Amino acid sequence: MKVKMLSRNPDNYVRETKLDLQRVPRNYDPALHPFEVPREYIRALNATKLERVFAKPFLASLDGHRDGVNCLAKHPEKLATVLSGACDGEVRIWNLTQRNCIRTIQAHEGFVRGICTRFCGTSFFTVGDDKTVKQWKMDGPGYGDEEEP
Amino acid sequence: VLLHVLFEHAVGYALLALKEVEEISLLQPQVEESVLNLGKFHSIVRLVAFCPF
């Protein structure tokens, strides 16, 4: 009579040192993993519940304009720099990482009706109610010098 | 955001490469661990060159 039995060699299945991590053999026989359809339905339902719990969209609010905001322009080269224009006539440059205002300029009298950035990113253009088109330099004025178009 | 940084030290000059980073939310309590934790820092920053004095 010839016979072998199912005898797992323990060294193949037990880790060797405490620094080692446990071994995990995997078997994908469907008999071992039943109820696949009801099971995944529960997992999907849990995921939708957690998505509603963790939905927190508001991040920050930036303050400093003294009249309502009217224009927005993003910087082509930098993610964290944005430009805004208010109805009183001021233009403000913001740092998104720091959530503060970098510069303030009295660009126009009346509203500012539009603002656009040159594709290189070293200048931007603005339009106001004083029937004027002005070109500014993206870099801030040096020292205490008043900023000039 | 792939860019190179030059770092000066008393021992020498170091040139490093940055792979990716969350720029806008970098100074936020959970995202800031990208630079604070050494394991996360290694994933996004590499040392490409070094010249000792």
């Binding site: 082509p76 080269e77 993610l79 | 955001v1 792939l2 990716e20 980073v21 969350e22 720029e23």
Partner: peptide, 12 residues
């Protein structure tokens, strides 16, 4: 990629 600016499609 988290920090990279995405530009519009260009002919290529």
């Amino acid at each position: 990629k988290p920090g990279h600016i995405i530009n519009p499609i260009k002919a290529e």
